[PDB]
DNA sequence: CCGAATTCG
DNA sequence: CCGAATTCG
């Protein structure tokens, strides 16, 4: 059974407001797929070790140690881990910086990378400079290896050009897919009230790059999760959960 | 010969927003008025009450507001000095404070004089929105008339960068305070180190308020000397303004 | 009326 | 945490 899916989701571990009760959502969405690879963002202490406790067959990698970061988790058994390394944005006035991970999936090497980049409109031109730095250090990311990041990226699809644009070796997997009709946002304020804000934004800020290296992993689907409100009132976060499929 | 050629003007953001002690500032501000009595005065950010105070006191001088309601720039002309042939108002098509330019034409001793004062876009925010004023007003400037002295005095909300931003003055147009050679008493019209009237802790040192100057012709009219003014707490405890009055000394053939 | 930090909507 | 409008010192 040789396949491969991972998930990139911002849960807000920030908003404090029914906090366990939708980490207990997202841990069910979690089980229920069961990746082999989890990325998410804005994670803090209490969280990460309930997320220890439960999810128990995961080897767990976090940004920080304290306050809110990023973490990837991997599927023991079904992922061996080569090696972490953890690079943080020169420019950050927010703590934020770059998780990248190397593993290896049945024969098949894999770099995986998540990172949070400056939030706001107002640091924008951070953002950016983030990055590109995230970018050139995918392809800068060895010959021999398959690159993947997927993060909670803040930014517009015009801004994306701004920067300069994608190399011609790394892509985005919405993309890549034709654009989906379905995945075209993962910020949606009119499907998603947890924020409480009376404005209709549709924003997809969580990404997925790719970059074979000859390519022996397919990306098959694109999927979002987490698109029903818990029994509390609220959806487990305000950014909508991202699941991809792959094949080899 | 009480005046041999001399020419004196004040342009001043009088800040009618900060009622805190205002009319007694309002008095302070009209004894330094009364005091250098200068030929034409501009004034930004000034209310219907300051108005009608000004009108009051100063009574010699014949008053043109750039807006009837809310808060506005006006130009005081001193009148048995100044005869005025016509006053334009021209709003920015692309405020959104209610700024306008506020232009008016005048006869000095056969010398015409068009004499200009607006209050531009402030906060940073809108810097774009402000050039966009800025060069719309120098258009004006140069649109002019020509044999006409043109003087603009006003609250410009400008740094020296946003100006070369523009694409500079025009060859023509020279900002007053750069034509003497940048005094450095003159260096800032918006002291927060020496300012302290809306109780800020801040070392905010900007030079907000300019002069432009256009003769056409060869220039017969020579801007002279240029020189601050409000530089005293009041007994009030306030400063007349958190801006500082700008005086400004000019001589003709 | 600075300018970054709340608040409002 | 959108994005334009107060607030503090």
């Not at 396949?3 to 997202?26: H, K, P, Q, Y």
């Not at 090497?109 to 107002?122: A, D, I, K, P």
């Not at 379905?182 to 970059?211: E, P, V």
Request: glycine share 6%; charged share 25%; with cysteine.
């Amino acid at each position: 059974g040789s396949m491969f899916s991972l998930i990139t989701w911002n849960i807000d571990g920030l908003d404090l407001n029914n906090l366990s009760e939708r980490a207990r959502g997202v841990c069910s969405y979690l089980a229920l797929y069961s990746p082999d690879v989890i990325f998410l963002q804005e994670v803090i202490p209490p969280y990460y070790s309930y997320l220890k406790k439960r999810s128990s067959n995961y080897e767990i990698i976090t940004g920080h140690e304290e306050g809110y970061f990023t973490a990837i988790m991997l599927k023991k058994s079904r992922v061996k881990l080569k090696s972490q390394e953890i690079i943080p944005f020169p420019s950050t006035k927010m703590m934020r910086n770059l998780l990248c991970v190397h593993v290896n999936v049945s024969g098949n090497e894999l770099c995986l990378m998540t990172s949070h980049l400056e939030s706001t409109r107002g640091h924008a031109a951070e953002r950016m400079n983030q990055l590109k730095m995230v970018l050139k250090k995918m392809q800068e990311a060895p010959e021999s290896a398959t690159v993947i990041f997927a993060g909670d990226t803040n930014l517009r699809d015009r801004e994306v050009t701004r920067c300069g644009g994608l190399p011609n070796n790394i892509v985005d997997v919405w993309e890549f897919l034709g654009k989906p009709k379905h995945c075209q946002y993962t910020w949606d304020t009119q499907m998603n009230s947890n924020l409480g804000i009376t404005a209709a934004c549709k924003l997809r800020f969580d990404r997925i790059f790719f970059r074979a290296a000859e390519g022996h992993i397919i990306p098959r689907s694109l999927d979002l999760l987490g698109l029903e409100k818990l029994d509390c009132g609220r959806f487990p976060s305000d950014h909508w959960g991202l699941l991809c499929n792959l094949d080899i």
